[PDB]
Target: beta trypsin
Amino acid sequence: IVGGYTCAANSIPYQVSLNSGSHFCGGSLINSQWVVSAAHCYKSRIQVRLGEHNIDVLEGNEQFINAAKIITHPNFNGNTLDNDIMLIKLSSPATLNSRVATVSLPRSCAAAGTECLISGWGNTKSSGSSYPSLLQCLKAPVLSNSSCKSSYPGQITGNMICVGFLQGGKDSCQGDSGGPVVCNGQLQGIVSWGYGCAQKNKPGVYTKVCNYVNWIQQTIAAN
Ligand SMILES: [Ca+2]
Model:
């Protein structure tokens, strides 16, 4: 997250880190046995780390649980990033408490202008690199389809939204991928793609979760 602030410890209790030796992408817990993330973050072995704030220190709130099943959307397209969404089933259920909690799926899609909270342990610099140990937060609004499609002509499908700022300076980046965009208590976005991070006139683009509630529910019931 570029241009953000350090979240209060354990204030984002549905955020997960996906780990394969080290943190590589984010995710959100949506029920006790299932995490949702981005399909472009796919790898064959993943450990899910819940209850994290500082990813470099063991703090005593953490649960580390191995993924048992990894399911990418059947129509994910690696060229356009359409349908960039993946579900992970945990090998044993997470135990829900004050530091580990689910986030609701969306009851409807969101209005332009809606304010949201984006979080993750991705890159924090817009020139260079630096990955933080402490979770970072950023508040940003859903952009109208007009501002989003003008930024990326021909590249925005019906399953994508833009959230962020056209002046640059504040955005998600590498390592935030798969993490949550939560607006009025509902998971509306998954960090997906963009041109660079925090560039003027190039806001982040996010998978539009309100189109996938049926797929998520049907996949959970079947597995
Ligand atoms: Ca920790």
Q: What stands out?
A: The chain has two helices and 13 strands.
